Amino acid sequence: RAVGRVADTVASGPVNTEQIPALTAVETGHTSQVVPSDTMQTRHVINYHTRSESSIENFMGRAACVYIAQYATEKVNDELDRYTNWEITTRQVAQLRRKLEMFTYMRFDLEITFVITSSQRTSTTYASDSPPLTHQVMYVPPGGPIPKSYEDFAWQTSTNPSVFWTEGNAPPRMSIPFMSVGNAYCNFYDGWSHFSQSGVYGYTTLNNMGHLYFRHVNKSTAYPVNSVARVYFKPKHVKAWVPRAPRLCPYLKARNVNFNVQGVTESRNKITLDRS
Amino acid sequence: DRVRSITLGNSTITTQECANVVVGYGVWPTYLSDHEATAVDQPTQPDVATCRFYTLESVKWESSSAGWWWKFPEALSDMGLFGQNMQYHYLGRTGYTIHVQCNASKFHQGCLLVVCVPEAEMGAATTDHAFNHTKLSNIGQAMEFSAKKSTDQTGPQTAVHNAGMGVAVGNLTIFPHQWINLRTNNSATIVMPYINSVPMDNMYRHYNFTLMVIPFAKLEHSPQASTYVPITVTVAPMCAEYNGLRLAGHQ
Amino acid sequence: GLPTMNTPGSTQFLTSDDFQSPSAMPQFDVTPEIQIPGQVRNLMEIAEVDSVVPVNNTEGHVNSMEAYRIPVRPQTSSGEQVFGFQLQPGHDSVLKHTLLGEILNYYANWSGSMKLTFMYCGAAMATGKFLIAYSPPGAGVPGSRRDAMLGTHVIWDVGLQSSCVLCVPWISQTNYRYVTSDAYTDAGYITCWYQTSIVTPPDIPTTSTILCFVSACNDFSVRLLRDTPFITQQALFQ
Amino acid sequence: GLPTMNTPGSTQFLTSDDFQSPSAMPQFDVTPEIQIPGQVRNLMEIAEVDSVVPVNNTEGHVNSMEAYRIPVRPQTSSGEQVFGFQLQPGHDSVLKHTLLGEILNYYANWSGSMKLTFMYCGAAMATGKFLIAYSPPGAGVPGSRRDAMLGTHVIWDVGLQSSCVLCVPWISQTNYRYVTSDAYTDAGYITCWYQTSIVTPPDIPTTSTILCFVSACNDFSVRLLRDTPFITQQALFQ
Amino acid sequence: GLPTMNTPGSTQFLTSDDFQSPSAMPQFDVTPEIQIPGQVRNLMEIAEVDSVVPVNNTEGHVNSMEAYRIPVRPQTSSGEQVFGFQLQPGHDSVLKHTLLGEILNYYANWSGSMKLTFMYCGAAMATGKFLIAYSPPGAGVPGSRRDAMLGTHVIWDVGLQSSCVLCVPWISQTNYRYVTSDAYTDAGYITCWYQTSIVTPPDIPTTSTILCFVSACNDFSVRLLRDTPFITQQALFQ
Amino acid sequence: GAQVSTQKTGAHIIHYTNINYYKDSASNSLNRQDFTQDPSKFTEPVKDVMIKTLPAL
Amino acid sequence: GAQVSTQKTGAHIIHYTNINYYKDSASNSLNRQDFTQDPSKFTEPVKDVMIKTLPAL
Amino acid sequence: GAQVSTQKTGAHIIHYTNINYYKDSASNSLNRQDFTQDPSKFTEPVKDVMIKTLPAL
Ligand SMILES: CCCCCCCCCCCCC/C=C/[C@H](O)[C@H](N)CO
């Protein structure tokens, strides 16, 4: 039988034995390995089903949006500045965060894909003629010189990895290896950053992955244009350890596991069923 | 069988109604290998002065008890030479033999889940607020859950059905666990290996795992039976080794 | 150059693709992996572990540990019902936040047999028999213990072994049922009944407790990944 | 032509790519290379060379040669401190403009043992003993020579061999520390103390000089290239 | 990269292409196929089955079962005509909604011989002879039974075997005729005539019934797929 | 250096070719076809073996 | 892993090459060149065989 | 003329193919995988050998 294929059930007849496969003990921590062939009469079924979709590589290997970065060709304030940044994290979106937090320690390579889209800002006029916009997504490793403005020297990217992309083409994509200073990425860290048990509690002290700076490399537009860049993480070559319980409560913050108290499941009116 | 004897150092545990032993994730604790080490200095391994049984204080089990938790290795910070080796070293590494024990009678009833949760990172009761470390765990005190939610301004969220982690309490049975059902079971022993993403670690700024003891079926009995049943926790380190000798910590 | 031609689908982002892409960190020395215990290679290893079911989830009981405590007591007449729920392991409110139920809500199709384990958490001096029955979905709900004795069932004798396993078999006309329920792929009902009673000596409390556990068998499989309808957000978490 | 399809990432400039490209000067005859001495094939050959450390960098001393001159003198009582600094070879002000420190600021991760060499530049008639200690970062700074004798240390006897090497070992829980410092990857402290004293004959100056040198050991490695936060410009140099 | 060049036809959608494309469901476990009876591998297996022809389709008869009932009766003189239609199996109103005719309207070219089967559905005491004739298209329609006896024909004797087959041969100058008719590829005429009469005993109804069936022979082939001019819609079906 | 492997097909022209283009293994595609598993770390992690037919206590 | 097959030509340099690029068999092209058929399920599905020359009844 | 070489992988399907397309060697890609080194030109460039255990003077 191939690897990943489920088990067949064997033909079983009537029994009158001193064997008791149905009776067990949950107190031992043991999950009983009872087959339907042990408690009832079955036929021989050749099961051809496979556990393909349930692999850790197949369950994780789909790209999910992790951040929406906004920046313009004319500054409104420092939130709609000429440039923007993002501290690299997986906790701001809830769909990928719940999938990663089913494990305590993981170890994967990444694919980062950007879906950058622009839009003309609301104005009294729009009738212009502009050349195609080109964007820069520079990665800054932890501790490097960050762009303090537009027209900065730090966008010279002589040693930082950069990418350039003109609007209209395919989305940009690069591959990232496993980047932790330990032996696995820690989804959870039950501890503090200082030795006196103070400072920052949680997984935030084990996430030093750097920043990701975005801009328009075009100097100007006739009328201001707002851009949005969506960041897509797809984990590949995935290992995972110590499976966690799934989360019940929705998230509140990105740097905490803080929650509001909720019931264990949705309710019903009574514990029985009452028809014929 | 129901009998089992565990001997570590100069200490012995005997049990006449044992369910079984749960061994971790199928891994026995051992010392770090040469192809996995990072530190270069020679470790110290006090084999019997540290890998012995250390018993904690009992907790009174009531009908309205929600549960208790202990965080490790901070639960044994003052237990003999296991606590003296934590203070003098930067790194440490150990597995454990947790033994929880509670006898009542053939006329009592109750059931306790005994889970060992690695990296049981707890949320805050009052959100947008960081909590104190002495509310997470004192040095050997049993920190206890609550039946309803907590409004502590600097404490964890101790509602027991969310288990402090925002998950369903019923789903904790993937972590290494046993049950103490008073109908059939007297004690519960779990052998935990070293679980971390690094080969050694600091034993003060990091709680490696948390032992929770939760009544799923509550304690009830006749009023003319013994109204006091305690729950004692006896923990033995296993294959404990240390690195980075300097002055006594731990700031 | 080499004469080429572009097919439909060029310059697209299909999020479930599988293509090579260049590295931003070339010749990066990745740290060596070590033996961490508890490695997971499949989500079916997680779903084959017991997880206690909140059968008593009539609110207000879901906001306490009363949701897991199925109550039993000595009876005045026999054959009454203990509990009952539909066998919808990804859609029913009893089973969809269990550990097997949470994995199935990432998928659209499920297949295989399941294991319902029960655990009597009463006093060691109290005895009892129970009938736990599974009904295929054709006739409706069983209305009595006579209606339930006609399907797949097991009689559990409470003794020194505190636990019994009702194995729910895969009796279906399709190879897969749907996780979100419909009428074409309905799976049936699970009910429990007093086979005899609870008989106790004096000086013992009346009400006892039964814990129900769910897990998957070794022929269980899932299919067609999807997003789960359990986590939501209106804005980015800051 | 050959039917093709374009993946994501087409028509982009990733600055750390590795692709072939046509030549603007075809069949250009490149001049023959000769043997020039001192060829460098790795930046770890540069970082394994001693470079004198400015331990005395309390300004105003950085604008003179006084920054490199650690002063010692005969004492009235023993066990006092000579100097001390944090072991942050890319972030601490004592070590980040040394020759080992300048290479590490091009990188984000460092790993390995280091060599602190000391050089007594006093008169040949003056004797002395010193204790140079390394402390792992758990307990805090050592407060005395009693606090420093508990960690990795060496007692140096000043004699005919003017130099001693304190080897700082790699005692870490991770395989890499960060160059820009944080609390998770703190590396500890280096301190020096009077083991005995400086004892001189008459007609000799009081204050002597000790020079500290840093270099990397043969298990040293760096990782994750970055831009250095040391050179800046507001406009193009004309 | 590899130097390439794009031919004409890049970035187009030709709806009858044949190209590979990536999967939206990777490693999807498809359910196993079973033996279902009646597998179809070719539309020529469908067209080689008999299907009863509405020869009597003079309205109002098409809105009832009278369209299939060719009437015969005892005659006063012999050699009269029973029925007649043009051999246009995709364009003639008699043959274009039959089961052979509906497949041919998906195509533009047809080729091969055909089988016209006839079935006498009168009483078992009634006898009769018939002449069923095929005429190649050169001279026009046959005007009498004398005109029809000069082409391909068969005399059918009604007896214990109720059915006869007139085989219409492929007599063409091209290898393919057109489904929508034209004058270059005209195929001819099918007529039927009284060879003798219907002779019955007393106490029997006058009018009997003949059923005509069409099917394709084993040298039949179709070519050049197209849309059928039979189904229409003005909006999307909601 | 072409690795011809088996395609994912059903049960009752089935091969694909792969060339690696880049010098880093993190640049490679996903390992879709690895279905190995052993659930005894979680479902039966007890010290003494527990046979089904025999009593658990 | 190249499958060289015969091209569709007429009757009275005739081969093509195919490489499979993807790991799923549903990603493959169409099976254009499969012309097998057996029409006896529909045209002659009777229990006893019926020879043409012999009478049917 | 394909050079199959070893990909950069970690430690505890690992090969890539390269074809050269141009007639000039300056058109080639980078030599990423050349990690040879000898630091004795700089760290120990003295005439007489200096053993560690022996005194330097
Ligand atoms: C303009 C070029 C952009 C290049 C992009 C490089 C950014 C990627 C480097 C850091 C990768 C970090 C991967 C994150 C892993 C998660 O945080 C872990 N699951 C949690 O520890």
From TrEMBL, chains F, G, H:
Q: Which family does it belong to?
A: Belongs to the picornaviruses polyprotein family.
**Compartment(s) of residence:** Host cell; Virion
Name its species.
Echovirus E30
Q: What does this protein do?
A: Lies on the inner surface of the capsid shell. After binding to the host receptor, the capsid undergoes conformational changes. Capsid protein VP4 is released, Capsid protein VP1 N-terminus is externalized, and together, they shape a pore in the host membrane through which the viral genome is translocated into the host cell cytoplasm. Component of immature procapsids, which is cleaved into capsid proteins VP4 and VP2 after maturation. Allows the capsid to remain inactive before the maturation step.
This protein's assembly is summarised as:
Interacts with capsid protein VP1 and capsid protein VP3 to form heterotrimeric protomers.
In the complete protein, the residues contained here run 2 to 68 of 131
Name the domain of life this protein comes from. Answer: Viruses
Q: What is this protein called?
A: Genome polyprotein
